[PDB]
Coordinates of C-alpha atoms and ligand atoms in Angstrom, one line a residue:
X1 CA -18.6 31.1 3.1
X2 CA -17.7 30.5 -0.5
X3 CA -15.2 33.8 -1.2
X4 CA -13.1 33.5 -4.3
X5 CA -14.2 29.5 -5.0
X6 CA -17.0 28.9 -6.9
X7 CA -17.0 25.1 -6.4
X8 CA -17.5 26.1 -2.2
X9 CA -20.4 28.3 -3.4
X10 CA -22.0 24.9 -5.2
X11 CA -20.7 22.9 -2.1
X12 CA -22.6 24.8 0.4
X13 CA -25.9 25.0 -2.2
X14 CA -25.8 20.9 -2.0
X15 CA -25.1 21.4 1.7
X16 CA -22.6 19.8 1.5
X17 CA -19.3 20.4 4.0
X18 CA -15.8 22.0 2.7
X19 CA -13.0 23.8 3.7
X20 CA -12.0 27.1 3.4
X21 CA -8.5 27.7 2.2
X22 CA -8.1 30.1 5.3
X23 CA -8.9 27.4 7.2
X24 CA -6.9 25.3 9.9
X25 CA -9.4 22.4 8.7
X26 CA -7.5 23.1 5.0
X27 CA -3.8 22.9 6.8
X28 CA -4.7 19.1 7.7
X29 CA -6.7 17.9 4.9
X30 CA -5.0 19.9 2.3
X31 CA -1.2 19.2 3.3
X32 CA 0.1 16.0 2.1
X33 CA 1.3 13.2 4.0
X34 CA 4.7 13.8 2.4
X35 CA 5.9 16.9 2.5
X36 CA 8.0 16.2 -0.8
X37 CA 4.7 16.3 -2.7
X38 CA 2.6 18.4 -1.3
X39 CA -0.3 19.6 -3.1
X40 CA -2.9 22.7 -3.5
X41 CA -6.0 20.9 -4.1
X42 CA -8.3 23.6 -6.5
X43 CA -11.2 22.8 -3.1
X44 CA -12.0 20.6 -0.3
X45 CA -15.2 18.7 0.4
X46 CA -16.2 16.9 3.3
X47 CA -18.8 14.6 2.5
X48 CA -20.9 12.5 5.3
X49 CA -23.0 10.2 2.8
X50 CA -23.3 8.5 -0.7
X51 CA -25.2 11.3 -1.8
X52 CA -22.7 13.6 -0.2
X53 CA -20.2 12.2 -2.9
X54 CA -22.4 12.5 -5.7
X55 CA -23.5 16.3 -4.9
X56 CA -19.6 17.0 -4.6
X57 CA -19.0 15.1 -7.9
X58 CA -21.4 16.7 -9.5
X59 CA -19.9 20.6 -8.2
X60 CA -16.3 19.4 -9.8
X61 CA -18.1 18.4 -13.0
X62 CA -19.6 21.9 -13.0
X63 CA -16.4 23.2 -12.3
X64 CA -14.8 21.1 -14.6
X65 CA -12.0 20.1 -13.1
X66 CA -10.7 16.4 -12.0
X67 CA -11.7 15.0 -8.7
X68 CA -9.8 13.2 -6.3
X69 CA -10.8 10.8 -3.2
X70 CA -8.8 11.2 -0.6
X71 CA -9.0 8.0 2.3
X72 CA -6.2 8.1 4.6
X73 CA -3.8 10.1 2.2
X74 CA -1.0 7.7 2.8
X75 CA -0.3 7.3 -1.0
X76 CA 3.6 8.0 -1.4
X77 CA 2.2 10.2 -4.5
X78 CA -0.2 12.0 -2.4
X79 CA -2.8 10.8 -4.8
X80 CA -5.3 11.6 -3.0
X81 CA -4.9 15.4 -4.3
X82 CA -4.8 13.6 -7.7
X83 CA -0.8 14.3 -7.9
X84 CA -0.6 17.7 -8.9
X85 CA -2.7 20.7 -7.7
X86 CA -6.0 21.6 -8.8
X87 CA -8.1 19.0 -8.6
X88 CA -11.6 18.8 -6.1
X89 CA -10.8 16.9 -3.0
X90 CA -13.6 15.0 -1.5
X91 CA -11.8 14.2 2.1
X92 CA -13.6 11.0 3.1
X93 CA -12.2 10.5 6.8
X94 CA -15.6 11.3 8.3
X95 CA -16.8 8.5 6.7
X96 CA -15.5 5.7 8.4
X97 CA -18.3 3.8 9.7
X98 CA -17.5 0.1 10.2
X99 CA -20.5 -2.7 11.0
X100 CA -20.3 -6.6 11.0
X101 CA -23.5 -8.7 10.3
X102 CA -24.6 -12.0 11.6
X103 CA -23.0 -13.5 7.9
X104 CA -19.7 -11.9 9.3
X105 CA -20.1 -9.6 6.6
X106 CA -18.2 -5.9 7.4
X107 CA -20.0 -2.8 6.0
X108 CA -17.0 -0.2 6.3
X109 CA -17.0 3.4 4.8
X110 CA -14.9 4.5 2.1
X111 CA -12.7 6.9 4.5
X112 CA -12.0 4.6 7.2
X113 CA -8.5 3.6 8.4
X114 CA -7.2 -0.1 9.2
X115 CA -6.3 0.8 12.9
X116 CA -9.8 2.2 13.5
X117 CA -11.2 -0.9 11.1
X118 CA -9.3 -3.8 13.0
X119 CA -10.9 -2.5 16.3
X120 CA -13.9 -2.5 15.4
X121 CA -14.1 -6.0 13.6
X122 CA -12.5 -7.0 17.0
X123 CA -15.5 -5.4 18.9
X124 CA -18.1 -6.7 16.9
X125 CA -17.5 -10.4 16.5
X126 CA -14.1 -11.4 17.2
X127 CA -13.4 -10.5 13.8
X128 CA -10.4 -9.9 11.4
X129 CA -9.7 -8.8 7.5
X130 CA -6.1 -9.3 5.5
X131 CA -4.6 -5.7 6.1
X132 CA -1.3 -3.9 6.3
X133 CA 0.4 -2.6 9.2
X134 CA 0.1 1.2 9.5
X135 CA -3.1 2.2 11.4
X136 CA -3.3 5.5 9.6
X137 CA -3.9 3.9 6.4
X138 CA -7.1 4.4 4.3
X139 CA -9.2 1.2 3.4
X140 CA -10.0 2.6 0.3
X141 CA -6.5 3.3 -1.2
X142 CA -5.4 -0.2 0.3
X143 CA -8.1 -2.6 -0.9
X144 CA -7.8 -0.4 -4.4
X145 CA -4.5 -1.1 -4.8
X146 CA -4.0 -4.6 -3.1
X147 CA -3.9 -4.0 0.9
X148 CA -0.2 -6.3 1.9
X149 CA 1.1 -6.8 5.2
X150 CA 2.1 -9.8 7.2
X151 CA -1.3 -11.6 6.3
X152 CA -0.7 -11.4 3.0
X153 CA 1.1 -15.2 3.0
X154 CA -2.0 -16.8 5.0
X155 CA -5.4 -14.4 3.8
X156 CA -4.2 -13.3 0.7
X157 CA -4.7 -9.6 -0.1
X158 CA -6.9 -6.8 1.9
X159 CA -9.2 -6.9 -1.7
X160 CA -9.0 -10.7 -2.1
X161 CA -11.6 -10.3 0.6
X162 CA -14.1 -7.6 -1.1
X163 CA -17.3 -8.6 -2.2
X164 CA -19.1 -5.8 -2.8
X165 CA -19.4 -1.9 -2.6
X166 CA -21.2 1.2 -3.2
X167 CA -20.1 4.0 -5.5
X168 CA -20.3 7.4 -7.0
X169 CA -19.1 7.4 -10.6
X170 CA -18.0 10.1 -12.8
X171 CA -21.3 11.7 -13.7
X172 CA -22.5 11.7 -10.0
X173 CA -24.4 8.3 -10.9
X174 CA -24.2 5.9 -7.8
X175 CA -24.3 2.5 -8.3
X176 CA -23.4 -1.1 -6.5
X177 CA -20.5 -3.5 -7.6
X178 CA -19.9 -7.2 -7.0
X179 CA -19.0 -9.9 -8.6
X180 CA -22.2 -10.0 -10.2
X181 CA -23.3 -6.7 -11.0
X182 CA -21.3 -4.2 -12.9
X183 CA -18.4 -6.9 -12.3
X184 CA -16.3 -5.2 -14.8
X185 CA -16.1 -2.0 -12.5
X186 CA -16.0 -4.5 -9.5
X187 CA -12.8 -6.0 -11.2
X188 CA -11.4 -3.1 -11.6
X189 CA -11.6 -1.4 -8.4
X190 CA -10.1 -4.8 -6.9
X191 CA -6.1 -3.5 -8.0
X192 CA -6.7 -0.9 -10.6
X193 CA -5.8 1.7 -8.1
X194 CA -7.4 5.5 -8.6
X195 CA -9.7 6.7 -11.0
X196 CA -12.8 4.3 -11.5
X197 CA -15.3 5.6 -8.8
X198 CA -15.3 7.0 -5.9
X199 CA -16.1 4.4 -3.1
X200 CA -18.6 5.6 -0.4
X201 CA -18.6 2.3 1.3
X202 CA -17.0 -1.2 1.1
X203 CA -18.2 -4.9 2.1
X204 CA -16.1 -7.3 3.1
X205 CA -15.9 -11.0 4.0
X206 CA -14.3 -11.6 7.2
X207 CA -12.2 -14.5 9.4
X208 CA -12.6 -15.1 13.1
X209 CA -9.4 -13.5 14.9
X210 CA -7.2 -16.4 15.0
X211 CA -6.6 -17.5 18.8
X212 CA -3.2 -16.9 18.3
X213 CA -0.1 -15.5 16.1
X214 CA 3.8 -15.6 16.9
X215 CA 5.4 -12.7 15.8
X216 CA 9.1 -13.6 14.9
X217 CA 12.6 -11.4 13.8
X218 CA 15.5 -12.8 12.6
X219 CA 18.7 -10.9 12.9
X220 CA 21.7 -11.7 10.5
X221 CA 25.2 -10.8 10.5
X222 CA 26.1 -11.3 7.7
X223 CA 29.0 -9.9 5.1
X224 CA 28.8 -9.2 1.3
X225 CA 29.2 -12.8 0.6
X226 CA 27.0 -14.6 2.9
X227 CA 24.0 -12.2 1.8
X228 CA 24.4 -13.6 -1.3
X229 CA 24.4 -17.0 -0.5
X230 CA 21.1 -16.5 2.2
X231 CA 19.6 -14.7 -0.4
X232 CA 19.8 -17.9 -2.2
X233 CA 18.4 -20.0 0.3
X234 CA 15.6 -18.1 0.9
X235 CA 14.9 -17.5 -2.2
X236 CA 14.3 -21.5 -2.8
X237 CA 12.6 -22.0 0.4
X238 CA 10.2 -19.0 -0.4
X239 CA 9.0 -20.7 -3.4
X240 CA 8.8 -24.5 -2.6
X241 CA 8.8 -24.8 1.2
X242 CA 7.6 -21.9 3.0
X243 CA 3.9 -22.6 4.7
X244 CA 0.8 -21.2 4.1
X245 CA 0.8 -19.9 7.3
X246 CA 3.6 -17.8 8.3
X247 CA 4.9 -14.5 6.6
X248 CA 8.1 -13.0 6.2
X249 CA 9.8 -9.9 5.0
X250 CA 13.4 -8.8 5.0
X251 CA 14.1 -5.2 6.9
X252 CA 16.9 -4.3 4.8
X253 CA 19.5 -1.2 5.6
X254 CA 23.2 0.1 5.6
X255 CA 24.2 -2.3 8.3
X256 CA 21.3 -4.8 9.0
X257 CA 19.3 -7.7 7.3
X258 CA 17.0 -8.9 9.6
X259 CA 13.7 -11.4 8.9
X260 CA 10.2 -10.6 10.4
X261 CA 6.9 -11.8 10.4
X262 CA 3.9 -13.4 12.1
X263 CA 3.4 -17.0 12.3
X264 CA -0.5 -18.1 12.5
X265 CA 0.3 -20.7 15.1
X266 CA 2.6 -21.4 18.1
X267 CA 6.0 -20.7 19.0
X268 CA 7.3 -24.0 19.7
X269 CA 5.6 -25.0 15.7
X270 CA 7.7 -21.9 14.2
X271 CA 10.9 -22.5 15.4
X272 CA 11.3 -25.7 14.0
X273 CA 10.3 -24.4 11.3
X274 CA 12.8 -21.7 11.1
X275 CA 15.4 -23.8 12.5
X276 CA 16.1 -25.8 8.8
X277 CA 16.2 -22.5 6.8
X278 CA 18.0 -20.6 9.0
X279 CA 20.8 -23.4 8.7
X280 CA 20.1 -23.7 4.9
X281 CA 21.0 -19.6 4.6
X282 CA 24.5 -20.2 6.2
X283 CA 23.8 -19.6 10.0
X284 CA 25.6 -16.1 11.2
X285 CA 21.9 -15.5 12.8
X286 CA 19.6 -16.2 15.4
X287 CA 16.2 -15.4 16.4
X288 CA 15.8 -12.0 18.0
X289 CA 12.0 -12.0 18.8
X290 CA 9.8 -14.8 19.7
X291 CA 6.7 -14.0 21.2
X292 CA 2.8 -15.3 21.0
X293 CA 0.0 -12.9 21.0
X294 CA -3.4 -12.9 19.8
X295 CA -4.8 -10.5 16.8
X296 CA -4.8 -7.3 18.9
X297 CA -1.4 -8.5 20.0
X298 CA 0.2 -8.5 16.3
X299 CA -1.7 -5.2 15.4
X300 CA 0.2 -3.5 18.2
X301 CA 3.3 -5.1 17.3
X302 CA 4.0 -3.1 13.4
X303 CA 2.4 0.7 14.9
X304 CA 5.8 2.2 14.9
X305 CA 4.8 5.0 17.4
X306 CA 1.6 5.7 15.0
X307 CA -1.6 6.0 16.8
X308 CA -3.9 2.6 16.9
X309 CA -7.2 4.0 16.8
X310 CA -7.4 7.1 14.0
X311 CA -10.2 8.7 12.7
X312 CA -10.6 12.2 11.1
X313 CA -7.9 13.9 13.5
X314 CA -4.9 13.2 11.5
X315 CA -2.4 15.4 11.1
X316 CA 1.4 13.4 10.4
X317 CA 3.6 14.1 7.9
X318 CA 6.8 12.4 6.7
X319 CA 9.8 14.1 3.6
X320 CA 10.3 10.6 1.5
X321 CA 11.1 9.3 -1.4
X322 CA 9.9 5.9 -2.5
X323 CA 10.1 3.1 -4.6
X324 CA 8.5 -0.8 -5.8
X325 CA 9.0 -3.8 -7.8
X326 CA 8.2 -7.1 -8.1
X327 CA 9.6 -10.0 -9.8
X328 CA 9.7 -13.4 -10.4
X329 CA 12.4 -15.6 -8.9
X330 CA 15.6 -14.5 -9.6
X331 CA 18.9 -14.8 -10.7
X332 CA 22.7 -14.9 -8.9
X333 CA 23.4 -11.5 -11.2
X334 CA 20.2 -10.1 -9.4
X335 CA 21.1 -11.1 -6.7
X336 CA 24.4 -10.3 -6.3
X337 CA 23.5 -6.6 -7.5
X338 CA 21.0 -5.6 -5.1
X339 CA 23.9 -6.6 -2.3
X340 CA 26.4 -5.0 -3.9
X341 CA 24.7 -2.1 -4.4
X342 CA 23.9 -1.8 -0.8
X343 CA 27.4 -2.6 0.1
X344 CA 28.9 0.0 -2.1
X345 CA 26.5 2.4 -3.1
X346 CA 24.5 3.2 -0.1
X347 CA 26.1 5.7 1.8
X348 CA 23.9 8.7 2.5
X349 CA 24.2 12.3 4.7
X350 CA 24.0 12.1 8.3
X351 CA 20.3 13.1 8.7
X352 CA 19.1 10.8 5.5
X353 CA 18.3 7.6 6.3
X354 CA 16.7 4.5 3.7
X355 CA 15.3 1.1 4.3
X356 CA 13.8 -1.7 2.3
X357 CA 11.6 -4.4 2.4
X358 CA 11.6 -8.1 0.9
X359 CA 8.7 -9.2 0.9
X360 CA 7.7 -12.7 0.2
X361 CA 5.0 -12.5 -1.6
X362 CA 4.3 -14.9 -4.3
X363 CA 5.6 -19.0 -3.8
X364 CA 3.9 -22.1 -4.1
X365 CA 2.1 -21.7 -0.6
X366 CA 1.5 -18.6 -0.4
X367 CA -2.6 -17.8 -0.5
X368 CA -2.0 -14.2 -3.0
X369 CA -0.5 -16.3 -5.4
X370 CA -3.7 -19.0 -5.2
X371 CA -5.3 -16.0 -7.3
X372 CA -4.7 -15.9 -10.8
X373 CA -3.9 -12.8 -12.8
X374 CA -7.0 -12.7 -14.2
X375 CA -9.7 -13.0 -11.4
X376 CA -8.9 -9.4 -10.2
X377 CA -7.3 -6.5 -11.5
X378 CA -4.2 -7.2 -9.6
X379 CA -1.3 -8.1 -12.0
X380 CA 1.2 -9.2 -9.9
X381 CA 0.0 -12.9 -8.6
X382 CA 3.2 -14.4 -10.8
X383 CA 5.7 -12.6 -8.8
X384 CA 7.4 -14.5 -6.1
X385 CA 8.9 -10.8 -4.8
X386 CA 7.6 -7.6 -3.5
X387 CA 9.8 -4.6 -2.2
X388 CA 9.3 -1.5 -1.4
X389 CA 12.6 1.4 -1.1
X390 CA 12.3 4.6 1.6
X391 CA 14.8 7.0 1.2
X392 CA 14.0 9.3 4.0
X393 CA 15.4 13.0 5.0
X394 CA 14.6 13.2 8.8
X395 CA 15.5 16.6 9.3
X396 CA 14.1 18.0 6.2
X397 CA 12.2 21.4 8.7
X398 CA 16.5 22.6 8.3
X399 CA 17.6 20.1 5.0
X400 CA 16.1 18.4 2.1
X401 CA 19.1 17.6 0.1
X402 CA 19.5 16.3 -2.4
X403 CA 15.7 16.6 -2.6
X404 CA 13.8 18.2 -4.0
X405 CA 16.5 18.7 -7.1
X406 CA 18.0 15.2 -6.9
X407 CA 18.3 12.2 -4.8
X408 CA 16.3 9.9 -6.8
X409 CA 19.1 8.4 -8.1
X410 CA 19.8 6.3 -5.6
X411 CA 16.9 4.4 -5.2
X412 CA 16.2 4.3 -8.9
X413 CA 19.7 2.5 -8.9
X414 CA 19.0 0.3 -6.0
X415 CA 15.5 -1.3 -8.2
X416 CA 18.0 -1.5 -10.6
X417 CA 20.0 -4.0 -9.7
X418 CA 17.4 -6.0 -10.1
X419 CA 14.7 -4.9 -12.4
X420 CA 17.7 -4.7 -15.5
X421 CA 17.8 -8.7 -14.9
X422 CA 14.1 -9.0 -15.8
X423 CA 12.2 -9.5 -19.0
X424 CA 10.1 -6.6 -20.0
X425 CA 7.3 -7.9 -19.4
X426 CA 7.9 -9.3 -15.7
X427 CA 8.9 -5.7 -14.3
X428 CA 6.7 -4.4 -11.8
X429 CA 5.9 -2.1 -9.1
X430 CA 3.0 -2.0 -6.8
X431 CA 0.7 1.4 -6.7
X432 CA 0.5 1.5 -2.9
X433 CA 4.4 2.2 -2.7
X434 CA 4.2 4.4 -5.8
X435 CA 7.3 5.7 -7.5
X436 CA 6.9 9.7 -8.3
X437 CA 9.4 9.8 -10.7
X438 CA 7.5 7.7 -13.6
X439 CA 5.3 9.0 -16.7
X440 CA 1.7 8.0 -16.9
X441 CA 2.5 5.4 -19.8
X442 CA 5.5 4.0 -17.7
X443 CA 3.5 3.5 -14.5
X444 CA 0.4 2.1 -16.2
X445 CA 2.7 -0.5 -17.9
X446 CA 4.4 -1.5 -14.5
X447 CA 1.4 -0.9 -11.7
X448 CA -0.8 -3.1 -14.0
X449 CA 0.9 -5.0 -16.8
X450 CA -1.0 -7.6 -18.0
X451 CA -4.2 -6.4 -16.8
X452 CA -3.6 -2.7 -18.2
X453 CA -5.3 -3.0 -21.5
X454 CA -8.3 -4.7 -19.9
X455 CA -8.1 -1.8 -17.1
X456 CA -8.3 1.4 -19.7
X457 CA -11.1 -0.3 -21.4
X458 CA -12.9 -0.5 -18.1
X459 CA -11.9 3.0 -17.6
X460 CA -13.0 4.3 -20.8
X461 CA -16.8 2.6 -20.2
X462 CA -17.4 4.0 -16.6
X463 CA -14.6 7.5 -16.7
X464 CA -14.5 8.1 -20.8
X465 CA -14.0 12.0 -19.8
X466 CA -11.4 11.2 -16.9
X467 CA -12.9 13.0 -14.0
X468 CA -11.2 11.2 -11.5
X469 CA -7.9 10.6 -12.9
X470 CA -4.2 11.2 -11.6
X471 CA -0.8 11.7 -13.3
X472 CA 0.0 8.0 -13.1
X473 CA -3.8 6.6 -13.3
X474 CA -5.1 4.2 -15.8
X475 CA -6.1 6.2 -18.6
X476 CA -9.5 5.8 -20.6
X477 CA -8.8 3.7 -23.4
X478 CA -11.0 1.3 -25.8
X479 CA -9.8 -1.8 -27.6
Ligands
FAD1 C1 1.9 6.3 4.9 C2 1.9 4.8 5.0 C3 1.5 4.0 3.8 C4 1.4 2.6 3.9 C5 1.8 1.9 5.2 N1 1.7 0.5 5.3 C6 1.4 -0.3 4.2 C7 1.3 -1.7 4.4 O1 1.5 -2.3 5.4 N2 0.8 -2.4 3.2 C8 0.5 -1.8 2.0 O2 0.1 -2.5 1.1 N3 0.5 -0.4 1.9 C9 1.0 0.3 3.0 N4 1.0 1.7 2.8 C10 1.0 2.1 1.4 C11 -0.2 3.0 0.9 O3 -0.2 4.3 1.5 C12 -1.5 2.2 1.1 O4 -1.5 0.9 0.7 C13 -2.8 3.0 0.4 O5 -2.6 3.1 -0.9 C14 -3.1 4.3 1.1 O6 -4.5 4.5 1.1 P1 -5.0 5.9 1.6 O7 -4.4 6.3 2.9 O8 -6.5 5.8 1.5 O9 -4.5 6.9 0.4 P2 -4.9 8.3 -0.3 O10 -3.6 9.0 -0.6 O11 -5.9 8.9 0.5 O12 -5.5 7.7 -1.6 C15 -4.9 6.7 -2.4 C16 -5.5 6.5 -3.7 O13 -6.7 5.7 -4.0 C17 -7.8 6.5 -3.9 N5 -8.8 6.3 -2.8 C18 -8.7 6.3 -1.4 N6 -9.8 6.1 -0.8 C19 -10.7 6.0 -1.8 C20 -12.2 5.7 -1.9 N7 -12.9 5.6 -0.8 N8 -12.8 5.6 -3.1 C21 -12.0 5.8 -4.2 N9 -10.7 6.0 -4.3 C22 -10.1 6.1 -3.0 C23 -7.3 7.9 -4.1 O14 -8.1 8.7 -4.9 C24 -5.8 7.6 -4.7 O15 -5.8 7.3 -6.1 C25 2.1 2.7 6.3 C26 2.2 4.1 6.2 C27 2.6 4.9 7.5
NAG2 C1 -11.7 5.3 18.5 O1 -12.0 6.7 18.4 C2 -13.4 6.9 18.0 C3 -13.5 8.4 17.8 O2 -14.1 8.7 16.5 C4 -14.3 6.4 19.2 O3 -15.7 6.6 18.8 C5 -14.0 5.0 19.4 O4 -14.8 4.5 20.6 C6 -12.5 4.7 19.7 N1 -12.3 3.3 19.7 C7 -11.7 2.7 20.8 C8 -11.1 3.7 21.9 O5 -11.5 1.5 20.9
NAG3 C1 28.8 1.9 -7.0 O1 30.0 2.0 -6.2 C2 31.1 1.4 -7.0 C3 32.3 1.6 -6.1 O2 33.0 0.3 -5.9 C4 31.3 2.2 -8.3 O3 32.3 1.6 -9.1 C5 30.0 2.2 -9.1 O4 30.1 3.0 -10.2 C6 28.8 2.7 -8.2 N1 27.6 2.7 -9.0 C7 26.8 3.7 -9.0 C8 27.3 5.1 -9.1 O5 25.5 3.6 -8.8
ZN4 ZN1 -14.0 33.2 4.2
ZN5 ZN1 -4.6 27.2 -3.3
ZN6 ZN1 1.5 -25.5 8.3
ZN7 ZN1 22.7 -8.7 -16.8

């Protein structure tokens, strides 16, 4: 029953599902991924429809409080909750239908995950969409902010693929998007993150499962000085030779730079073609994994002990602290920085552990950066870089020092190394590896830059009252 929440009472009047805060059904959906930020949403709905969403809008607008979808909750921010308490939670994971047409077309609901998505596109069709690599992710906060993973290079991003959708908008209204109708909003939901509807489901165009992908690592050993120098390397090769069809990133730690990827062809094809800029990059490495496998093959490769196939029984939970940027190419001083930094300044407690990702991202072959700035609301197809910073506390159930009082300052120090050797304009970060620590007027500035004024003008024509906003959000703001 409804006891002590009024917005249950309207819930249950619109027959519409929820949870009750005594509830084991609230533990799960109303306990962040990370515990760091863990929320109290003010409710919890469970819609099973479009007009599931709308009747559950239309109870938080009643209520007048802010509402926040929640996909997959795998935002670093736990945005889902709307990154703070009090906000209505519409918990979408029992909405996660997924259904190709004869066009190849994928109809998937706005709570489904890309493990449970990739099956399914394999099942019906031999079919395969531009994703990242964690299973557990939600569609909807991927596509919204970008969707990257080792596709990325070849496909572009997860919402370079989006054609269409159907959504619930801040006064319960639902409507359809493409790139004909309502195309502002449609442009908008395509990398302006949270906050411009609430999408009940999503429509995709698709490509065949290629027949086969190589999955590569590199493994370096290589000292202060030759990180520099491969840095280098691969920093030119990135952005004038590197081939449409192959992906990289650098798994970056304490003691370890390795390369990894998948190569959207054969073996024998990608070693010669890692053979040249391995040598460019000053040798000290050699290929660690070499392997071909079909679609299926390279899904199971990045699950990291995570569960393939997830639906609405998810229940893991990390203590983290994370960090983005992207940048253009860069210089020796940046360069040098970021290695010194992790040479000198990254020692941690034993039970803290951190990581980071290169990604390569932008370059001249590279099918995200065949998009300009202005075709979606992604800002970042200029940026030859992408990384993302983990600074994780593995026994935080017994220790989270420094967290939650400090900590931050290391990987704050790590971006900047290299974000202090950027314009203003050109720094960056990407929404779907939020930062915590930044204002709403900082994190607007570097989730959307050049796209941000369009983005709160958008925002202010289809959320003027902020409904569905969170503390980092594009805010509603007319030109
Ligand atoms: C935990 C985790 C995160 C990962 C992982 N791997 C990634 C990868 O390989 N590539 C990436 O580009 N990102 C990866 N991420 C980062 C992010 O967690 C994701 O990219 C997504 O942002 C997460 O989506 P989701 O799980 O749906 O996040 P929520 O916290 O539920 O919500 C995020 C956000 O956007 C809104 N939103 C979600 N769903 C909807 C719908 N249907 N309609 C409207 N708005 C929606 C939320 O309101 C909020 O603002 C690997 C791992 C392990
Ligand atoms: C994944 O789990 C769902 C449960 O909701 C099930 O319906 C589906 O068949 C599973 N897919 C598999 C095992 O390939
Ligand atoms: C990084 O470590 C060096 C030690 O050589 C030190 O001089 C520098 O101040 C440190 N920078 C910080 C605290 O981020
Ligand atoms: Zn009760
Ligand atoms: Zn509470
Ligand atoms: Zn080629
Ligand atoms: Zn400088």
């Amino acid at each position: 029953e409804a006891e002590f929440n009024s917005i249950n009472a309207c819930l249950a009047a619109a027959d519409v599902e929820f949870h009750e805060e005594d509830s084991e059904g609230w533990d799960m959906d109303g306990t962040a991924f990370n515990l760091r930020v863990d929320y109290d949403p003010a409710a919890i709905a469970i819609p099973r429809s479009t007009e599931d969403i709308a009747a559950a809008v239309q109870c938080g607008l009643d209520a007048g409080v802010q509402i926040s979808a929640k996909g997959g909750g795998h935002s670093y921010g736990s945005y889902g909750f709307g990154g703070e308490d009090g906000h209505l939670m519409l918990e979408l994971d029992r909405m996660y239908r997924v259904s190709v047409d004869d066009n190849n077309v994928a109809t998937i609901q706005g709570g489904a995950r890309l493990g449970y998505t990739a099956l399914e596109l394999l099942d019906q069709g031999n079919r395969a969409l531009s994703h990242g690599t964690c299973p557990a992710v939600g569609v909807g906060g991927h596509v919204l902010g970008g969707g990257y993973g080792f596709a990325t290079h070849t496909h572009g991003l997860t919402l370079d693929w989006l054609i269409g959708a159907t959504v619930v908008l801040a006064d319960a209204s639902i409507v359809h998007v493409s790139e004909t109708e309502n195309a502002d909003l449609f442009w908008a939901l395509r990398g302006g993150g949270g906050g411009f509807a609430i999408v009940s489901e999503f429509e995709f165009n698709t490509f065949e499962a290629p027949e086969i992908i190589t999955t590569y690592q590199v493994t370096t050993t290589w000292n202060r000085k030759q990180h520099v120098a491969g840095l280098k390397a691969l920093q030119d090769w990135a952005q004038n030779t590197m081939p449409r069809e192959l992906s990289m990133r650098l798994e970056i730690n304490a003691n370890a730079l390795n390369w990894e990827g998948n190569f959207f062809g054969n073996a024998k094809d990608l070693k010669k073609i890692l053979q040249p800029i391995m040598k460019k990059a000053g040798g000290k490495s050699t290929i660690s994994k070499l392997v071909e496998t079909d679609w299926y093959g390279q899904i199971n490769t990045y699950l990291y002990g995570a569960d393939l196939n997830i639906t609405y029984n998810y229940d893991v939970h990390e203590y983290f602290y994370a960090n983005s940027l992207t940048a253009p190419r860069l210089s020796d001083e940046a360069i040098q920085a970021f290695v010194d930094y992790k040479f000198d300044n990254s020692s941690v407690r034993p039970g803290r552990g951190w990581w980071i990702q290169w990604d390569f991202h932008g370059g001249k072959n590279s099918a995200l950066a065949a998009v300009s700035n202005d075709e979606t609301a992604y800002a970042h197809r200029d940026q030859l870089w992408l990384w993302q910073f983990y600074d994780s506390i593995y026994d935080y159930e017994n220790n989270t020092s420094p967290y939650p009082e400090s900590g931050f300052e290391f990987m704050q120090g790590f971006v900047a190394t290299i974000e202090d050797t950027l314009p203003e304009d050109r720094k960056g970060k990407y929404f779907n590896y939020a930062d915590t620590t930044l204002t709403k007027e900082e994190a607007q500035k570097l989730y959307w830059r050049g796209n941000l004024e369009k983005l709160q003008a958008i925002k202010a024509k289809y959320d003027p009252e902020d409904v569905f906003g969170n503390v980092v959000s594009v805010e509603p703001i007319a030109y």
